[PDB]
Amino acid sequence: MKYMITSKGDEKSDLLRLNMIAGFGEYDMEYDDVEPEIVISIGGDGTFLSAFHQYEERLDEIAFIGIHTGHLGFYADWRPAEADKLVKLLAKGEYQKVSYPLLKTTVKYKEATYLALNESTVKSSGGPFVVDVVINDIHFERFRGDGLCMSTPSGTTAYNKSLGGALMHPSIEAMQLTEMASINNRVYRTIGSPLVFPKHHVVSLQPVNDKDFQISVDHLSILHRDVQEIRYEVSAKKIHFARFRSFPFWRRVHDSFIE
Amino acid sequence: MKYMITSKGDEKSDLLRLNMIAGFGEYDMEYDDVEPEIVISIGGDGTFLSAFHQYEERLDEIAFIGIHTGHLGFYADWRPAEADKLVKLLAKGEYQKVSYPLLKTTVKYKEATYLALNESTVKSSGGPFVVDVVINDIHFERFRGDGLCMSTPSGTTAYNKSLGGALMHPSIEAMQLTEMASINNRVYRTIGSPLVFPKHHVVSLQPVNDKDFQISVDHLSILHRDVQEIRYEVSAKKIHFARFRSFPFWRRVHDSFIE
Amino acid sequence: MKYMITSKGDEKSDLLRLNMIAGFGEYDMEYDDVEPEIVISIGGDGTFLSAFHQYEERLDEIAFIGIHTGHLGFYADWRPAEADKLVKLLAKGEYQKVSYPLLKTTVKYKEATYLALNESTVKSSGGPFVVDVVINDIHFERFRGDGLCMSTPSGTTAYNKSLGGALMHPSIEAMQLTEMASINNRVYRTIGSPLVFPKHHVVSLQPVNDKDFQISVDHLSILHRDVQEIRYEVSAKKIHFARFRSFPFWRRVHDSFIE
Amino acid sequence: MKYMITSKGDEKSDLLRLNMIAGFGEYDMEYDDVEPEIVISIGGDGTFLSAFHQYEERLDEIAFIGIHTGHLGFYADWRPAEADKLVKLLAKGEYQKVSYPLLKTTVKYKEATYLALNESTVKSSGGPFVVDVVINDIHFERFRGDGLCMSTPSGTTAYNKSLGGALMHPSIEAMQLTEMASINNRVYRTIGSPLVFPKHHVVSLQPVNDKDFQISVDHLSILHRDVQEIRYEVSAKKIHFARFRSFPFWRRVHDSFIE
Ligand SMILES: CN(CC#Cc1nc2c(N)ncnc2n1[C@@H]1O[C@H](CNC(=O)Nc2cccc3ccccc23)[C@@H](O)[C@H]1O)C[C@H]1O[C@@H](n2cnc3c(N)ncnc32)[C@H](O)[C@@H]1O
Ligand SMILES: CN(CC#Cc1nc2c(N)ncnc2n1[C@@H]1O[C@H](CNC(=O)Nc2cccc3ccccc23)[C@@H](O)[C@H]1O)C[C@H]1O[C@@H](n2cnc3c(N)ncnc32)[C@H](O)[C@@H]1O
Ligand SMILES: CN(CC#Cc1nc2c(N)ncnc2n1[C@@H]1O[C@H](CNC(=O)Nc2cccc3ccccc23)[C@@H](O)[C@H]1O)C[C@H]1O[C@@H](n2cnc3c(N)ncnc32)[C@H](O)[C@@H]1O
Numbered sequence A, B, C, D: 001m002k003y004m005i006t007s008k009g010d011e012k013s014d015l016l017r018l019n020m021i022a023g024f025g026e027y028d029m030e031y032d033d034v035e036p037e038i039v040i041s042i043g044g045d046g047t048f049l050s051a052f053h054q055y056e057e058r059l060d061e062i063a064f065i066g067i068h069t070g071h072l073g074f075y076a077d078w079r080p081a082e083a084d085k086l087v088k089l090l091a092k093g094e095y096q097k098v099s100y101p102l103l104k105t106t107v108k109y110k111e112a113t114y115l116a117l118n119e120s121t122v123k124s125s126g127g128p129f130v131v132d133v134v135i136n137d138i139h140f141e142r143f144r145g146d147g148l149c150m151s152t153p154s155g156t157t158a159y160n161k162s163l164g165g166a167l168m169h170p171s172i173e174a175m176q177l178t179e180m181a182s183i184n185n186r187v188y189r190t191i192g193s194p195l196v197f198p199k200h201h202v203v204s205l206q207p208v209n210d211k212d213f214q215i216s217v218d219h220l221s222i223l224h225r226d227v228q229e230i231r232y233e234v235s236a237k238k239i240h241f242a243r244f245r246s247f248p249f250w251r252r253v254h255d256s257f258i259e
């Protein structure tokens, strides 16, 4: 079936990509980077993120696979030495698909929407970051600090984790909001705790004075001007992985952070 | 319909309970503290917890209602001044039921199971608390510290919150584990972050050396001797509330912690 | 004696500054914004910071005084209603001076040094912030995250506090380093805890790859290019306050954050 | 000169203690566990703590030395393989003494005072721990939670660290207070941040309702009944170490927690 392969760009990843392609030639696997059904990432989680965003408009017709050439990633959970064994089962099929929820970010001024696999982040364009946080049209708090991070389930082991957020299993269709260095005194008051919102809940950020913010989605971070609203909600779209062996999320957590 | 009313025990709560009963007498509402269908708590969240545990074996046939005589609680979300208006709608009906997930705690040595509305906590009986944490039969970490807290969704605004845990909407069928003062060095390593587990996941705690632990479920805290295993999982049972007005969880959070 | 007065710039602060000046005219108090011995700030802590930096090269010959027109600040610990009583004791004298330690920041490429009253902060110019942290010529850790904050004693109630740092009494000649969102896994390892360094200890930050950093000292934040080293140490210079009533630091903390 | 040696009690530590004694016999080093001038601990930090408390009434006439048979400790900073080289320099002398500050804890009901090398901890005897915290006779906050930890400088790498406290160099004559799981809402308010107090500052804990508390000093934890006041202050006494090689505190931190 149709497939494509992204590479980190170094000698190790490029040479492994050419060997897999030659392995796929020994089957009737057509290379097609326009309409692939199978997307293989080789490198690290950053390389996987690029591959996800490169085909984020055909997520429903693609199964992703990660191969880590550096250290183990959460999305690149295949060592290079298992590449030949990976090629065989890919060519036949008989693999189940697992789906992780995604995060939708709407930015009104027209309006622009983004899909994130890890998280969507807002900071100030210089000076204080002040937003009113609104949950399902309910004013929840006025946040003054460095920024905010809305994380997918599978993103919680990333930036969200460094911000004190909880780690949550990717089968939970939810999103998690964490704070960056909120000021808290008699005047300003934030909840402090991370917040975990379910599907169909809309978290909206509304500016107070400064309307310019630096918003980032996974890799890309672009400065938005004259922002009226930032909306977060669990996406209706989901990223599909091709799984062959059992690699539970919590084992992946153990290997990455404990031993 | 059958109903009963629990009181905090002070003058304010006892006198409000007698006035509601007299109000219920003006309807055909039979008082029955053996098989009630409606359980009204008057006082604070602690008073509500007692009422929940008093009838924790008939949760499927009961709708709970909380009235806070002190400050606002998360389960006692009715002011005393709304008691008369509460009596009327209760007697008629035409109220929807909302259900919050619960936490099941199994303690093997026979074996004893408990149901918690807030959280289940383990500490050492004196000296160091050391347990191996196992997730779905996968050894995750060896924890050395003061203890661990497994919190329901609606419990996350309680002890879980003071332990740095995330706050999560009660519609999410999950449980959250937080640490108390874990040591972390070159020898000992814990994840640190709070963990959010979905339904049908079993978190098991297994002793290393000391087998005596102080385990607490909501109010009660009993010392267990010669413990072989502590199992946590999302309960199949759910607590049902009787809701009349709209009081969203996040509004309840706002009122309790922000303003 | 010679004196000058800085104003926040709004109607309330400007009108109070003109009334104090007229009050000082009723004494032989010469206004001199070039070589003042007494610097009065009117507004908030930000207004005080500006006044400190405006005369940071004559700190040894100046006593500062703060008047908060908005809410209470840590440096502007005088209400406007006490301005007349402040003018009298200032004109006579008979006031003791209290001194708070300061932070010195050296940036080598020549080299530039800065004096901070609150804290000195480093972040990346875009992308990952990676520095090697060196303590008294001892490689301590390789930091990967959003940035670092070195805080004076009296700065610990500011940014340092929002970053989880400890609050410390200003009589302690020390500086405190806190982290912003450090990544921690099997590869990267930071201490996590805030660090409190004594006088004559030199904390040096050394770049790994990217040499561009956004460094901020109190108000000002300037982008530095081709940075070779950032040195932190307790300054030999100290800021002198003019104190009239007893306002202990811990009372100032209580009023600002508790009640 | 007079000396004694404490052992952890296992085969490795006991056999090393007998070899050092035989090594000391080859000099005119008199063994005297009643009035020793040199106290050698063999085992871990716990073994060192016991040795400190065993002679806590002759601290001014003793230099302590630690040898870690397990992993490296902060006080047992000598490997067993360096025992012979340690014996030689001990017998001659020509070693400088370094002194770490200590913590004094007064418990009034008569009154009992304690000296700690790591920290002094208070918890409730069952149920809620509620104390009013008073700083230099100034009511600072009403604490409701699990407990409080007052840590020496050299204790900050211990329990204090697990409680989010700052790590501070032992040359700083100070003490640090950290919280355990303080509740914080609209009713209850604590500072949250760790607090670092200088010498001659008195932190006093005063009960609200329950007068029974479990107080611990380093190893020992005893239940106190009918407590009227708990006083913390930097002790006037100091523990003296015998140092031979340069082992800076921050290197000791690096080895223990980073690499
Ligand atoms: C513009 N101020 C002036 C100051 C000061 C200040 N001194 C102290 C102090 N010794 N002790 C206790 N409180 C203090 N104040 C309190 O500062 C409040 C106003 N300042 C403020 O809103 N600043 C910011 C808040 C949030 C985001 C910001 C982003 C960019 C720049 C500033 C931000 C007053 O009301 C005073 O009461 C500069 C100070 O801003 C501190 N700062 C920067 N980032 C954060 C942050 N993320 N969280 C908390 N603080 C932050 C930084 O340390 C500067 O020194
Ligand atoms: C029995 N030890 C002796 C000691 C010491 C000690 N000094 C220091 C220090 N200056 N700097 C750096 N590291 C230190 N060590 C490290 O202590 C490790 C062993 N000790 C330990 O396992 N203790 C505990 C861990 C977890 C739960 C405990 C429950 C009850 C009692 C002790 C518990 C050695 O390997 C050394 O390297 C007493 C010390 O235990 C500290 N402690 C108590 N509770 C916790 C906690 N929840 N988290 C972290 N520490 C805690 C407390 O401060 C005592 O001073
Ligand atoms: C360039 N990466 C790609 C990714 C990813 C990623 N996904 C996950 C995940 N699902 N679960 C677990 N681990 C993950 N990884 C781990 O990311 C490591 C490399 N990435 C990294 O070094 N990033 C950064 C670290 C420190 C400062 C940064 C500043 C700007 C931009 C990125 C920064 C790999 O080794 C993977 O194992 C983008 C991700 O960077 C995350 N990020 C941004 N800021 C921080 C921060 N302050 N602290 C921690 N993470 C941060 C953000 O969430 C992006 O998704």
Ligand SMILES: CN(CC#Cc1nc2c(N)ncnc2n1[C@@H]1O[C@H](CNC(=O)Nc2cccc3ccccc23)[C@@H](O)[C@H]1O)C[C@H]1O[C@@H](n2cnc3c(N)ncnc32)[C@H](O)[C@@H]1O
Binding pocket: B044, B045, B046, B047, B049, B072, B073, B074, B118, B119, B154, B155, B156, B157, B158, B159, B160, B162, B218, B219, D126, D127, D128, D129, D144, D145, D146, D180, D181, D182, D183
């Ligand atoms: C006796 N209460 C009944 C309850 C509850 C409760 N439910 C919730 C909830 N779903 N969501 C939000 N808030 C809640 N409340 C708030 O509880 C406050 C009163 N309770 C309280 O003061 N408890 C304690 C505070 C501090 C130390 C304690 C030590 C031993 C026992 C209890 C302690 C009310 O005002 C409600 O508004 C039992 C609950 O105490 C929680 N708890 C235990 N230890 C801590 C701690 N260290 N920090 C924070 N909470 C702690 C634990 O989870 C029990 O479920």
